[PDB]
Amino acid sequence: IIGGWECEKHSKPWQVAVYHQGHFQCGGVLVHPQWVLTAAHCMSDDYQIWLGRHNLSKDEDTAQFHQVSDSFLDPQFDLSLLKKKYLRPYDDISHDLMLLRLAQPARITDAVKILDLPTQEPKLGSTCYTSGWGLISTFTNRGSGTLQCVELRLQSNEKCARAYPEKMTEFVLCATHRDDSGSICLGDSGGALICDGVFQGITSWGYSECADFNDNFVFTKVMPHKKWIKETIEKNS
């Protein structure tokens, strides 16, 4: 996140850090002790999953290390996108979602907790928060340092649709920021968007340039994916 603030330590205890070979790749959400939800463009051949983190730049006692046993992509994700190192600003984020099954269940602590799925549609005008470690340095270090947060307002989708109207679907949300001061970065992918205290969106931004909240769809909407998320967990735990 660019233009945010350092979150209170352990205030986002569902926040995941996904690494590959010691290099930070993206965020994610712990949605069940055995499951992380993140973006499909964050697929890799060897996951290192970290729960309970705050400052990625140092060792932390609350940190919990996990490997992954299986990956499940939204079946409607266009698999040809996986060949690209970076998605394009016009690429559809509707189905850019993946569930990672943890080899061993997370231990629930003050620092490591699940985030419940939404039980109602989000209201326009609600206050939202998202979190992540994504840096502007997307070619060299995708995430480091302390977990950042930003406050947003949930808006009608058309407010985010002007640059790429084709990205406006039933599977996205529009959450704006006070001025042109805030952007989301690739490494923020997988971060929860929590609106009026409910998990409603998840960051899915795969391009190398960071995105202003006000001009782009960067959050995949969780509600239309509930059946698939819940059924995948039920069938594969």
Confirm if 222 and 201 have CB atoms less than 8 A apart. Answer: yes
Structure tokens at 231: 């059924």
Q: Smallest Cα–Cα separation from 43: which of 1, 94, 85, 82?
A: 82
Q: Is 22 left (phi over 0), alpha (psi -120 to 50) or beta?
A: left
Tell me if residue 96 is catalytic: yes
Question: Which residue in this structure is represented by tokens 């060949």?
Answer: 83
Of the residues 41, 66, 95, 225, only one is catalytic, namely: 41
Spatial CB neighbours of 215, under 8 Å, sequence gap ≥ 6: 160, 162, 163
Of the residues 94, 131, 183, 189, only one is catalytic, namely: 189
Of the residues 96, 131, 204, 225, only one is catalytic, namely: 96
Tell me if residue 189 is catalytic: yes
Active site residues: 41, 96, 189
